Subunit: 115 residues, 3 copies
């Protein structure tokens, strides 16, 4: 698929998702929620959407990545919503792996008001 | 898909999921967990289940969705388990958008004891 | 599919996923991050991965269950990561239900620099 930017890595066939990288250094205060920039834009294959989810690597550092949805239509740059649930400040280095992007099929149906 | 209620909105073909609205005003203290009623019931097509995920606008505020798994064989009023993981209280308003329902395919396998 | 272990339960066809059980009694001190062992190994079918979603009941009980991903090629023992977000110690008991395992299709493609 087509991408723009360099904050995303190719993956192995047996891997489920692509690693997302922080576009710059980030400092998270205790309890802070922050949208982390990746600097990448994607062109998803029709019929699919991207699920953003945490990597165990950073989850073990006290940072919870909130579930993200990348729509087939979405052409903006990808940001990862992250919260620091620990009691101290945490720093993320530039280009550090922060999340995983997984491409899943999406089903579209019309809504009928029935019983 | 067949629905009952109006706490869900239709989507574009390029939209991965359908927006879910809050059926009433909800106040959440820091660390508190509440189920937010949507006032909607739905019949999932065969072979699919529904995943609930929060929208960027609420996640960006410290709200997360717990156990957003709607089973293909479920017919009660869809309720969203929401947790306020931020350090302050927040109020979600009536009919405010709060999550998205994405329809994904089911995959049923039989569990077989064996050598991995 | 082939499994090794006792920490997972068969599911109905209407159930999107299988329940995962804590393999042992785990003690989490206030603010501690820990990997809860399930004692199960899977041999996921080709082209599919495993999505782990925490059980709502435990997320309501002072523990933040991180969403996890089991890769098709992953053959190790399944573990669930959790963070004690309360001001008190929390004990998880052996055989207690901690999450669900959903099997979903995975898409693989080479990444191509282009213009979006």
């Amino acid at each position: 698929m087509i991408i723009e930017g360099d904050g995303i890595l190719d993956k192995r066939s047996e891997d489920a998702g692509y690693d997302l990288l922080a576009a710059k250094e980030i400092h998270l205060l205790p309890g802070e929620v922050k949208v982390i920039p990746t600097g990448v834009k994607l062109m998803l294959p029709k019929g699919y959407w991207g699920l953003i989810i945490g990597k165990s690597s950073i989850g073990s550092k006290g940072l919870d990545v909130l579930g993200g949805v990348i729509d087939e239509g979405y052409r903006g740059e990808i940001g990862v919503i992250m919260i620091n649930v620990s009691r101290k400040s945490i720093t993320l280095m530039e280009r550090q792996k922060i999340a995983q992007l997984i491409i899943l099929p999406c089903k579209h149906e019309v809504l009928e008001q029935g019983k």
